[PDB]
Amino acid sequence: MQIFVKTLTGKTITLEVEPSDTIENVKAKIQDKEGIPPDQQRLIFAGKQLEDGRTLSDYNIQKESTLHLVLRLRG
Amino acid sequence: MQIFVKTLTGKTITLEVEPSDTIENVKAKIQDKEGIPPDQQRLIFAGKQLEDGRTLSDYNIQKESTLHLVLRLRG
Amino acid sequence: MQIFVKTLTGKTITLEVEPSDTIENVKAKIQDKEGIPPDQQRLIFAGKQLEDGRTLSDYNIQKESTLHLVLRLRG
Amino acid sequence: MQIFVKTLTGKTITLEVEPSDTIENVKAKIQDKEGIPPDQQRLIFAGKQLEDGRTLSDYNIQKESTLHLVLRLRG
């Protein structure tokens, strides 16, 4: 299945994922596509920051769902 | 199976792959060999731009097939 | 299950892991969260240095256990 | 099983591996332990450079075998 990740300027990243993929896997795929390492990534769905160890289905993220990407800064 | 990845100068990278390998896997292997991360890579077969989440067999890419590698620039 | 990795100022990194995870996998997860590559990491449990090729269950590390993270320097 | 990776000054890296592990997997473990990425690594066993896609058993690499590590430079 396909989902989308959007930056805050509305730039979009298209991903191929499975419901059993962890949020961490999704971050790895974002790194694969954009060079942004997982530790610098926060993903948000329905206003909620998503935890690395949980799956997409845990958050009811289904096909064509849109996630939001923001940076994690040091400190 | 074995495939070749050619740069635009005709330089060749030899890879060992399975038809069920994703294009992303191939890019990982190119990184394993040349240090070029996946997000900087564009793979082309028969003039067709190749997507990370799909497999080699999805494109009918066969033994001794040649992919072409070009860089992805920012913006 | 969830474990905690503690830095020496008592800063905490929380991880979701399986007992069958290798120490190396844990290091990969720490890299996923903090950007610290595995080779720079030493993990300690009950005063004992943990080996990359071994599992968490090999060390009898269970849920809510605390590991300590230390740096590996050159030479 | 256990194998050894030796530099040309004879410093040793100890690895635990499977016969079904690829040469690339070993290079990944060498990166995990020393921070040297696979593309900069050449491994030598029995006077021959080892190809990433082969398994250890393809080269008849056995328990207590020692591989030799040399750098790959740009050309």
mmCIF file of C-alpha atoms in Angstrom:
data_model
loop_
_atom_site.group_PDB
_atom_site.id
_atom_site.type_symbol
_atom_site.label_atom_id
_atom_site.label_comp_id
_atom_site.label_asym_id
_atom_site.label_seq_id
_atom_site.Cartn_x
_atom_site.Cartn_y
_atom_site.Cartn_z
ATOM 1 C CA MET A 1 0.000 0.000 0.000
ATOM 2 C CA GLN A 2 0.815 3.528 -0.655
ATOM 3 C CA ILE A 3 0.896 6.428 1.836
ATOM 4 C CA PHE A 4 2.093 10.034 1.637
ATOM 5 C CA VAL A 5 4.428 12.043 3.865
ATOM 6 C CA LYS A 6 4.160 15.864 3.664
ATOM 7 C CA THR A 7 6.603 18.554 4.779
ATOM 8 C CA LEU A 8 5.143 21.748 6.225
ATOM 9 C CA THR A 9 5.530 23.494 2.864
ATOM 10 C CA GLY A 10 3.324 20.759 1.434
ATOM 11 C CA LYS A 11 6.090 18.973 -0.461
ATOM 12 C CA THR A 12 5.104 15.335 -0.730
ATOM 13 C CA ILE A 13 6.914 12.009 -0.334
ATOM 14 C CA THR A 14 5.222 8.883 -1.704
ATOM 15 C CA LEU A 15 5.887 5.602 0.088
ATOM 16 C CA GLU A 16 5.109 1.938 -0.451
ATOM 17 C CA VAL A 17 4.384 0.324 2.913
ATOM 18 C CA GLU A 18 2.592 -2.523 4.687
ATOM 19 C CA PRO A 19 0.245 -2.091 7.694
ATOM 20 C CA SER A 20 2.710 -4.168 9.708
ATOM 21 C CA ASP A 21 5.512 -1.696 9.008
ATOM 22 C CA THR A 22 6.694 0.180 12.084
ATOM 23 C CA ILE A 23 6.892 3.969 12.170
ATOM 24 C CA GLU A 24 10.651 3.355 12.240
ATOM 25 C CA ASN A 25 10.547 1.471 8.915
ATOM 26 C CA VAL A 26 8.645 4.380 7.391
ATOM 27 C CA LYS A 27 11.379 6.727 8.620
ATOM 28 C CA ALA A 28 13.996 4.434 7.045
ATOM 29 C CA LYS A 29 12.100 4.747 3.746
ATOM 30 C CA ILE A 30 12.051 8.529 4.092
ATOM 31 C CA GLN A 31 15.827 8.405 4.547
ATOM 32 C CA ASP A 32 15.998 6.159 1.470
ATOM 33 C CA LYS A 33 14.163 8.815 -0.549
ATOM 34 C CA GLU A 34 15.417 12.096 0.929
ATOM 35 C CA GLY A 35 18.610 11.415 2.931
ATOM 36 C CA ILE A 36 17.033 12.558 6.213
ATOM 37 C CA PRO A 37 18.059 10.038 8.915
ATOM 38 C CA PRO A 38 15.363 8.628 11.238
ATOM 39 C CA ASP A 39 16.639 10.396 14.394
ATOM 40 C CA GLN A 40 15.960 13.787 12.794
ATOM 41 C CA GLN A 41 12.383 12.771 11.911
ATOM 42 C CA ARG A 42 9.094 13.192 13.716
ATOM 43 C CA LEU A 43 6.006 11.797 12.029
ATOM 44 C CA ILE A 44 2.481 12.978 12.814
ATOM 45 C CA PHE A 45 -0.930 11.503 12.017
ATOM 46 C CA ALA A 46 -4.171 13.164 13.144
ATOM 47 C CA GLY A 47 -2.283 15.631 15.337
ATOM 48 C CA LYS A 48 -0.404 12.868 17.155
ATOM 49 C CA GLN A 49 3.336 12.265 17.164
ATOM 50 C CA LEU A 50 3.983 8.651 16.180
ATOM 51 C CA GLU A 51 6.196 6.319 18.209
ATOM 52 C CA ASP A 52 8.929 4.389 16.397
ATOM 53 C CA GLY A 53 8.150 0.927 17.740
ATOM 54 C CA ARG A 54 4.463 0.905 16.840
ATOM 55 C CA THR A 55 2.984 -0.141 13.493
ATOM 56 C CA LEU A 56 0.888 1.732 10.939
ATOM 57 C CA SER A 57 -2.187 -0.368 11.750
ATOM 58 C CA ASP A 58 -1.733 0.467 15.440
ATOM 59 C CA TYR A 59 -2.543 4.031 14.387
ATOM 60 C CA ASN A 60 -5.124 2.932 11.818
ATOM 61 C CA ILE A 61 -2.992 4.382 9.047
ATOM 62 C CA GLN A 62 -4.474 2.982 5.855
ATOM 63 C CA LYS A 63 -3.759 3.291 2.132
ATOM 64 C CA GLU A 64 -3.519 6.867 0.792
ATOM 65 C CA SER A 65 -3.258 8.165 4.352
ATOM 66 C CA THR A 66 -1.137 11.287 4.714
ATOM 67 C CA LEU A 67 1.514 11.624 7.429
ATOM 68 C CA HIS A 68 3.253 14.832 8.400
ATOM 69 C CA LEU A 69 6.999 15.243 8.768
ATOM 70 C CA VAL A 70 8.770 17.656 11.115
ATOM 71 C CA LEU A 71 12.373 17.830 12.369
ATOM 72 C CA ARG A 72 13.656 16.771 15.761
ATOM 73 C CA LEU A 73 16.292 19.190 17.045
ATOM 74 C CA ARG A 74 19.074 18.517 19.553
ATOM 75 C CA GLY A 75 18.445 19.320 23.202
ATOM 76 C CA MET B 1 20.500 -13.400 -10.891
ATOM 77 C CA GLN B 2 23.104 -10.940 -12.150
ATOM 78 C CA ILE B 3 22.472 -7.445 -13.505
ATOM 79 C CA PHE B 4 24.597 -4.478 -14.458
ATOM 80 C CA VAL B 5 24.265 -0.839 -13.477
ATOM 81 C CA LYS B 6 25.884 1.583 -15.906
ATOM 82 C CA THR B 7 26.801 5.189 -15.324
ATOM 83 C CA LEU B 8 26.530 7.663 -18.135
ATOM 84 C CA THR B 9 30.220 7.188 -18.962
ATOM 85 C CA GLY B 10 29.574 3.469 -19.492
ATOM 86 C CA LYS B 11 31.240 2.461 -16.217
ATOM 87 C CA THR B 12 29.738 -0.782 -14.927
ATOM 88 C CA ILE B 13 28.536 -2.063 -11.568
ATOM 89 C CA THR B 14 27.778 -5.766 -11.324
ATOM 90 C CA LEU B 15 25.034 -6.869 -8.916
ATOM 91 C CA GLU B 16 23.620 -10.137 -7.617
ATOM 92 C CA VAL B 17 19.876 -9.868 -7.215
ATOM 93 C CA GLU B 18 16.621 -11.775 -7.000
ATOM 94 C CA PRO B 19 13.630 -10.848 -9.196
ATOM 95 C CA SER B 20 11.699 -10.153 -5.982
ATOM 96 C CA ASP B 21 14.306 -7.624 -4.846
ATOM 97 C CA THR B 22 12.924 -4.119 -4.616
ATOM 98 C CA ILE B 23 14.483 -1.263 -6.536
ATOM 99 C CA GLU B 24 15.333 0.136 -3.088
ATOM 100 C CA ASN B 25 17.273 -3.058 -2.313
ATOM 101 C CA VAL B 26 19.266 -2.571 -5.520
ATOM 102 C CA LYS B 27 20.065 1.021 -4.520
ATOM 103 C CA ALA B 28 21.200 -0.313 -1.149
ATOM 104 C CA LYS B 29 23.562 -2.666 -3.006
ATOM 105 C CA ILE B 30 24.867 0.191 -5.144
ATOM 106 C CA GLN B 31 25.518 2.070 -1.891
ATOM 107 C CA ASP B 32 27.227 -1.026 -0.458
ATOM 108 C CA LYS B 33 29.568 -0.834 -3.455
ATOM 109 C CA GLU B 34 30.129 2.836 -4.237
ATOM 110 C CA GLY B 35 29.077 4.772 -1.136
ATOM 111 C CA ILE B 36 26.272 6.570 -2.968
ATOM 112 C CA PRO B 37 23.206 6.656 -0.725
ATOM 113 C CA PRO B 38 19.850 5.583 -2.250
ATOM 114 C CA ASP B 39 18.254 9.074 -2.156
ATOM 115 C CA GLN B 40 20.938 10.304 -4.529
ATOM 116 C CA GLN B 41 20.185 7.470 -6.971
ATOM 117 C CA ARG B 42 17.895 7.251 -9.999
ATOM 118 C CA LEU B 43 17.698 3.911 -11.805
ATOM 119 C CA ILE B 44 16.437 3.689 -15.381
ATOM 120 C CA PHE B 45 15.473 0.685 -17.488
ATOM 121 C CA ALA B 46 14.418 1.020 -21.128
ATOM 122 C CA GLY B 47 13.799 4.741 -20.625
ATOM 123 C CA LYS B 48 11.478 3.999 -17.699
ATOM 124 C CA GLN B 49 12.075 5.702 -14.337
ATOM 125 C CA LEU B 50 12.204 3.095 -11.517
ATOM 126 C CA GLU B 51 10.330 3.310 -8.188
ATOM 127 C CA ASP B 52 11.843 2.071 -4.890
ATOM 128 C CA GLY B 53 8.960 -0.011 -3.567
ATOM 129 C CA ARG B 54 8.472 -2.147 -6.654
ATOM 130 C CA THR B 55 10.350 -5.344 -7.548
ATOM 131 C CA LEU B 56 12.632 -6.156 -10.482
ATOM 132 C CA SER B 57 10.111 -8.682 -11.817
ATOM 133 C CA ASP B 58 7.433 -5.965 -11.784
ATOM 134 C CA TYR B 59 9.477 -4.414 -14.604
ATOM 135 C CA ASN B 60 10.296 -7.687 -16.405
ATOM 136 C CA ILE B 61 13.962 -7.016 -15.682
ATOM 137 C CA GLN B 62 15.818 -10.192 -16.621
ATOM 138 C CA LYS B 63 19.250 -11.765 -16.226
ATOM 139 C CA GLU B 64 22.177 -9.696 -17.477
ATOM 140 C CA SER B 65 19.809 -6.726 -17.811
ATOM 141 C CA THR B 66 21.288 -3.260 -17.680
ATOM 142 C CA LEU B 67 20.010 -0.447 -15.490
ATOM 143 C CA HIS B 68 21.228 3.088 -15.947
ATOM 144 C CA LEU B 69 22.246 5.223 -12.994
ATOM 145 C CA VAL B 70 21.861 8.990 -12.795
ATOM 146 C CA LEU B 71 22.047 11.388 -9.848
ATOM 147 C CA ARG B 72 19.034 12.976 -8.152
ATOM 148 C CA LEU B 73 19.707 16.617 -7.342
ATOM 149 C CA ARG B 74 18.076 18.727 -4.648
ATOM 150 C CA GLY B 75 14.994 20.770 -5.505
ATOM 151 C CA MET C 1 8.732 -5.290 25.209
ATOM 152 C CA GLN C 2 10.208 -1.952 26.246
ATOM 153 C CA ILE C 3 13.653 -1.340 27.737
ATOM 154 C CA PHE C 4 15.530 1.773 28.734
ATOM 155 C CA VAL C 5 18.996 2.799 27.694
ATOM 156 C CA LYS C 6 20.606 5.225 30.023
ATOM 157 C CA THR C 7 23.312 7.647 29.314
ATOM 158 C CA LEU C 8 25.567 8.625 32.247
ATOM 159 C CA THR C 9 23.807 11.919 33.056
ATOM 160 C CA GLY C 10 20.802 9.650 33.530
ATOM 161 C CA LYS C 11 19.242 10.788 30.273
ATOM 162 C CA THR C 12 16.925 8.094 28.976
ATOM 163 C CA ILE C 13 16.384 6.492 25.606
ATOM 164 C CA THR C 14 13.311 4.277 25.549
ATOM 165 C CA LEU C 15 13.294 1.356 23.113
ATOM 166 C CA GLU C 16 10.793 -1.253 21.970
ATOM 167 C CA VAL C 17 12.566 -4.553 21.486
ATOM 168 C CA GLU C 18 12.134 -8.310 21.387
ATOM 169 C CA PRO C 19 14.084 -10.760 23.586
ATOM 170 C CA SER C 20 15.444 -12.244 20.348
ATOM 171 C CA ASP C 21 16.922 -8.894 19.322
ATOM 172 C CA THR C 22 20.703 -8.762 19.091
ATOM 173 C CA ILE C 23 22.724 -6.201 21.009
ATOM 174 C CA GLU C 24 23.631 -4.915 17.547
ATOM 175 C CA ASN C 25 19.913 -4.417 16.749
ATOM 176 C CA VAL C 26 19.581 -2.384 19.954
ATOM 177 C CA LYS C 27 22.526 -0.251 18.828
ATOM 178 C CA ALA C 28 20.788 0.219 15.472
ATOM 179 C CA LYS C 29 17.674 1.374 17.339
ATOM 180 C CA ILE C 30 19.753 3.832 19.386
ATOM 181 C CA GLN C 31 21.132 5.161 16.109
ATOM 182 C CA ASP C 32 17.554 5.403 14.824
ATOM 183 C CA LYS C 33 16.652 7.610 17.792
ATOM 184 C CA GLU C 34 19.830 9.590 18.482
ATOM 185 C CA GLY C 35 22.059 9.496 15.394
ATOM 186 C CA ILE C 36 24.903 7.771 17.244
ATOM 187 C CA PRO C 37 26.305 5.029 15.009
ATOM 188 C CA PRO C 38 26.651 1.516 16.506
ATOM 189 C CA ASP C 39 30.469 1.441 16.403
ATOM 190 C CA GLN C 40 30.571 4.391 18.806
ATOM 191 C CA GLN C 41 28.310 2.595 21.307
ATOM 192 C CA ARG C 42 29.061 0.312 24.226
ATOM 193 C CA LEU C 43 26.119 -1.189 26.101
ATOM 194 C CA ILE C 44 26.327 -2.349 29.720
ATOM 195 C CA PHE C 45 23.995 -4.492 31.831
ATOM 196 C CA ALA C 46 24.625 -5.178 35.521
ATOM 197 C CA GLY C 47 28.234 -4.009 35.168
ATOM 198 C CA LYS C 48 28.855 -6.229 32.144
ATOM 199 C CA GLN C 49 29.734 -5.198 28.583
ATOM 200 C CA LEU C 50 27.317 -6.593 25.986
ATOM 201 C CA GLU C 51 28.479 -8.346 22.818
ATOM 202 C CA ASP C 52 27.009 -7.373 19.421
ATOM 203 C CA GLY C 53 26.267 -10.885 18.189
ATOM 204 C CA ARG C 54 24.402 -11.937 21.326
ATOM 205 C CA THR C 55 20.684 -11.497 22.028
ATOM 206 C CA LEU C 56 18.867 -9.718 24.869
ATOM 207 C CA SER C 57 17.514 -13.053 26.040
ATOM 208 C CA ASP C 58 21.075 -14.420 26.010
ATOM 209 C CA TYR C 59 21.791 -11.848 28.737
ATOM 210 C CA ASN C 60 18.446 -12.471 30.430
ATOM 211 C CA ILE C 61 17.488 -8.869 29.777
ATOM 212 C CA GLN C 62 13.739 -8.599 30.334
ATOM 213 C CA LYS C 63 11.002 -5.958 30.078
ATOM 214 C CA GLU C 64 11.685 -2.595 31.763
ATOM 215 C CA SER C 65 15.375 -3.471 32.157
ATOM 216 C CA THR C 66 17.976 -0.704 32.147
ATOM 217 C CA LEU C 67 21.078 -0.720 29.974
ATOM 218 C CA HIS C 68 23.844 1.860 30.220
ATOM 219 C CA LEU C 69 25.270 3.496 27.129
ATOM 220 C CA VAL C 70 28.923 4.352 26.889
ATOM 221 C CA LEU C 71 31.069 5.676 24.024
ATOM 222 C CA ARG C 72 33.770 3.759 22.229
ATOM 223 C CA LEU C 73 36.809 5.889 21.385
ATOM 224 C CA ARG C 74 39.474 5.234 18.716
ATOM 225 C CA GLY C 75 42.608 3.247 19.480
ATOM 226 C CA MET D 1 29.878 -19.488 14.073
ATOM 227 C CA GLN D 2 32.990 -17.403 14.694
ATOM 228 C CA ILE D 3 35.414 -15.872 12.194
ATOM 229 C CA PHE D 4 38.204 -13.318 12.415
ATOM 230 C CA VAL D 5 38.876 -10.231 10.333
ATOM 231 C CA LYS D 6 42.493 -9.090 10.275
ATOM 232 C CA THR D 7 44.008 -5.838 9.064
ATOM 233 C CA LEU D 8 47.454 -5.944 7.465
ATOM 234 C CA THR D 9 49.141 -4.981 10.719
ATOM 235 C CA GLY D 10 47.348 -7.981 12.203
ATOM 236 C CA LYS D 11 44.817 -6.182 14.399
ATOM 237 C CA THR D 12 41.802 -8.433 14.776
ATOM 238 C CA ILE D 13 38.034 -8.053 14.617
ATOM 239 C CA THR D 14 36.059 -11.034 15.889
ATOM 240 C CA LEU D 15 32.694 -11.745 14.250
ATOM 241 C CA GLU D 16 29.934 -14.263 14.836
ATOM 242 C CA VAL D 17 28.343 -15.289 11.532
ATOM 243 C CA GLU D 18 26.287 -17.834 9.582
ATOM 244 C CA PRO D 19 27.603 -19.858 6.631
ATOM 245 C CA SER D 20 24.582 -18.487 4.766
ATOM 246 C CA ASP D 21 25.655 -14.906 5.541
ATOM 247 C CA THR D 22 26.799 -12.954 2.486
ATOM 248 C CA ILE D 23 30.198 -11.240 2.247
ATOM 249 C CA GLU D 24 28.167 -8.019 2.269
ATOM 250 C CA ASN D 25 26.606 -8.991 5.615
ATOM 251 C CA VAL D 26 30.110 -9.420 7.044
ATOM 252 C CA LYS D 27 31.094 -5.976 5.720
ATOM 253 C CA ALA D 28 27.976 -4.603 7.418
ATOM 254 C CA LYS D 29 29.126 -6.155 10.712
ATOM 255 C CA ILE D 30 32.572 -4.646 10.183
ATOM 256 C CA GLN D 31 30.841 -1.265 9.731
ATOM 257 C CA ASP D 32 28.772 -1.913 12.865
ATOM 258 C CA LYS D 33 31.972 -2.498 14.836
ATOM 259 C CA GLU D 34 34.458 -0.039 13.315
ATOM 260 C CA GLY D 35 32.450 2.512 11.336
ATOM 261 C CA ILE D 36 34.077 1.579 8.018
ATOM 262 C CA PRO D 37 31.354 1.457 5.348
ATOM 263 C CA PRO D 38 31.158 -1.619 3.099
ATOM 264 C CA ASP D 39 32.195 0.184 -0.123
ATOM 265 C CA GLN D 40 35.555 1.061 1.405
ATOM 266 C CA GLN D 41 36.122 -2.591 2.380
ATOM 267 C CA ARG D 42 37.793 -5.395 0.487
ATOM 268 C CA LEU D 43 37.888 -8.789 2.155
ATOM 269 C CA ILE D 44 40.426 -11.416 1.160
ATOM 270 C CA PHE D 45 40.322 -15.134 1.808
ATOM 271 C CA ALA D 46 42.704 -17.693 0.270
ATOM 272 C CA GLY D 47 44.473 -15.108 -1.873
ATOM 273 C CA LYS D 48 41.214 -13.993 -3.470
ATOM 274 C CA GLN D 49 39.054 -10.889 -3.135
ATOM 275 C CA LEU D 50 35.586 -11.879 -1.915
ATOM 276 C CA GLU D 51 32.397 -10.783 -3.711
ATOM 277 C CA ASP D 52 29.639 -9.211 -1.633
ATOM 278 C CA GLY D 53 26.839 -11.415 -2.990
ATOM 279 C CA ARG D 54 28.402 -14.746 -2.275
ATOM 280 C CA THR D 55 27.772 -16.600 0.951
ATOM 281 C CA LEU D 56 30.620 -17.561 3.257
ATOM 282 C CA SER D 57 30.054 -21.191 2.278
ATOM 283 C CA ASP D 58 30.354 -20.346 -1.443
ATOM 284 C CA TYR D 59 33.978 -19.589 -0.602
ATOM 285 C CA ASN D 60 34.232 -22.485 1.826
ATOM 286 C CA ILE D 61 34.839 -20.013 4.664
ATOM 287 C CA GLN D 62 34.756 -22.040 7.854
ATOM 288 C CA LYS D 63 34.825 -21.724 11.625
ATOM 289 C CA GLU D 64 37.922 -19.878 12.883
ATOM 290 C CA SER D 65 38.703 -18.718 9.358
ATOM 291 C CA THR D 66 40.382 -15.333 9.250
ATOM 292 C CA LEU D 67 39.626 -12.905 6.455
ATOM 293 C CA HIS D 68 41.877 -9.991 5.592
ATOM 294 C CA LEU D 69 40.630 -6.448 5.278
ATOM 295 C CA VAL D 70 42.134 -3.905 2.901
ATOM 296 C CA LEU D 71 40.846 -0.508 1.803
ATOM 297 C CA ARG D 72 39.153 0.218 -1.500
ATOM 298 C CA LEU D 73 40.276 3.550 -2.909
ATOM 299 C CA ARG D 74 38.529 5.744 -5.451
ATOM 300 C CA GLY D 75 39.297 5.274 -9.132
#
